[PDB]
């Protein structure tokens, strides 16, 4: 619901070219705040958000140790899954792991999730109850059994219900101005003649946070099926996001066309028109 | 913080 702490882990095997590549990133809501990358002499976990620049070495030392422990086990697991599926030792393969916790409006735990993927496809999922697993196949069933025997669910639930929630609180406090004080879209319409008798109206939403947004074109305030191209929401590179929506319109009929923007950072949905 | 608890597949 209200807020989340998620991590995304990628390990890629390179047999013959040393140990697997391992990258780990952490997000609060839509804001990345830490990263660990083992392509380096001594890879450390490092900050990726200015509100994380004021943590002491106790943070970085632990997170670095914890990151390296993760890389290690992901190496081991990459080996195991290669066996399970009897693949050649020459092949490069990808094990991914996402997990997160969400707060409800009361600031308390609402839900938790966790999911492994091998070569870009679900492998093993922690169920909603956080007490058991779903395996996609015979190999993943071997993994289910081993995690049952090891009480892995119980350990994951402690992380997700408790530790994860408690640090999310800390992070939301340290990045309050960015995470709670949202950034609404700066919003404008541009105009691009296609021919003699038609033009593209392009509705821009720029500089918005979080990433979730809706841009709609309407015709005399009603839903039309003209040509309406919508680009995928993209990062601005500074922590905010961008999107545009476009319609082709009969030249001279531009002002029958309104763009509607919805975003969590706006007091109210906004409406926008070409300004010649 | 990272998860301390690492499944063995």
């Amino acid at each position: 619901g209200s807020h989340s702490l998620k991590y995304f882990h990628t390990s890629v095997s390179r047999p013959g070219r040393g140990e697997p590549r391992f990258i780990s990133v952490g997000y609060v809501d839509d804001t990345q705040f830490v990263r660990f990358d083992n392509d380096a002499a001594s890879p450390r976990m490092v900050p990726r958000a200015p509100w994380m620049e004021q943590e002491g070495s106790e943070y970085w030392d632990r997170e670095t140790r914890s990151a390296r422990d993760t890389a290690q086990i992901f190496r081991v697991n990459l080996r195991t899954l290669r066996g399970y599926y009897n693949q050649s030792e020459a092949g490069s393969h990808t094990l991914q792991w996402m997990h997160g916790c969400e707060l409800g409006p009361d600031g308390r735990f609402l839900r938790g999730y966790e999911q492994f993927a091998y070569d870009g496809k679900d492998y093993l999922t922690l169920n909603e109850d956080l007490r058991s697993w779903t395996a996609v196949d015979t190999a993943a069933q071997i993994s289910e059994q081993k995690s049952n025997d090891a009480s892995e669910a119980e350990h994951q639930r402690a992380y997700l219900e408790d530790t994860c929630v408690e640090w999310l609180h800390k992070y939301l406090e340290k990045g309050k101005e960015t995470l709670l004080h949202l950034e609404p879209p700066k919003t404008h319409v541009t105009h691009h003649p296609i021919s003699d008798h038609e033009a593209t109206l392009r509705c821009w939403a720029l500089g918005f946070y979080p990433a979730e947004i809706t841009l709609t074109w309407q015709q005399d305030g009603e839903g039309h099926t003209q040509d309406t191209e919508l680009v995928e929401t993209r990062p601005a590179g500074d922590g905010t996001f961008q999107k545009w929506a476009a319609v082709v319109v009969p030249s001279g009929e531009e002002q029958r066309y309104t763009c509607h923007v919805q975003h969590e950072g706006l007091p109210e949905p906004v409406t926008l028109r070409w300004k010649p | 913080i990272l998860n301390p608890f690492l499944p063995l597949l």
Partner: T-cell receptor
Amino acid sequence: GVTQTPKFQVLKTGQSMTLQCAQDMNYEYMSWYRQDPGMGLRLIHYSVSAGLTDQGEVPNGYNVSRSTTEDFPLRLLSAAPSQTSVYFCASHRNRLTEAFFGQGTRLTVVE
Amino acid sequence: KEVEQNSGPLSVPEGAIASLNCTYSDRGSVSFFWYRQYSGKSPELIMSIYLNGLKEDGRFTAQLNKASQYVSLLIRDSQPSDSATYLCAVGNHNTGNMLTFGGGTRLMVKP
């Protein structure tokens, strides 16, 4: 699943020896603890995987190495009375989950 | 010490309830264990606990409270075979040093 040897052992001040520890489970983490009579276990050294080692709370007097996943020998460099103790080896799936101990080694260092 | 248990020893009448307590200094601890040791033998795991609240297994109940930084063990219907050293161990995720053990509480079930 954790074989530790020897069960008992006497040493003269200044001798060296090696305590063996083998695990069948192929876990990444192995450890050495010691316990003096009527006291807690105190961590000597440990290893997070093949070819890595770190110091515990009471490293002094001892070395360790981890060529293979399976074995984690402990090495008394130069025996002293203060090392008279019971030594337990362990294996662990994760750094911070259950430790599975060996049968132990009682070691008396005599002058 | 980081992990505090009273060494005791403690008596409990046979058939009565035994209670054991353990405190730890570091809020960053995330795993908790009760081991049992019969004299000069290796610790055998009784119960592991990771979520706040209660966990039950036969005659054994463990309570964890991370806000107050204690774990406890409760033994129903105490038997002679429950005479032992009860060892509390925590996984301190801030320091990373495998499992940290308290000095142990020695319990005597008296018939």
